[PDB]
Swiss-Prot record, chains A, B, C, D, E, F:
Consequence recorded when altering I3F: In a sporadic cancer; somatic mutation
Name recorded for this polypeptide: Cellular tumor antigen p53
Effect of E7V: In sporadic cancers; somatic mutation
Residues of the full protein shown: 252 to 258 of 393
Outcome of swapping L6R: In sporadic cancers; somatic mutation
Outcome of swapping E7K: In LFS; germline mutation and in sporadic cancers; somatic mutation
Self-association state and partner proteins as the record states: Forms homodimers and homotetramers. Binds DNA as a homotetramer. Interacts with AXIN1. Probably part of a complex consisting of TP53, HIPK2 and AXIN1. Interacts with histone acetyltransferases EP300 and methyltransferases HRMT1L2 and CARM1, and recruits them to promoters. Interacts (via C-terminus) with TAF1; when TAF1 is part of the TFIID complex. Interacts with ING4; this interaction may be indirect. Found in a complex with CABLES1 and TP73. Interacts with HIPK1, HIPK2, and TP53INP1. Interacts with WWOX. May interact with HCV core protein. Interacts with USP7 and SYVN1. (Microbial infection) Interacts with cancer-associated/HPV E6 viral proteins leading to ubiquitination and degradation of TP53 giving a possible model for cell growth regulation. This complex formation requires an additional factor, E6-AP, which stably associates with TP53 in the presence of E6.
Length: 7, 7, 7, 7, 7, 7
């Protein structure tokens, strides 16, 4: 389970 | 399960 | 379980 | 899993 | 897992 | 797990 958010 | 969001 | 957030 | 962003 | 951002 | 940011 992997969650990545970029901004 | 992998979630990735880019902006 | 891995969560990463970049801004 | 590899994410790269250039600007 | 590798994340790289350049600006 | 490697994270690199340049500016």
């Amino acid at each position: 389970l992997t969650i990545i958010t970029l901004e």
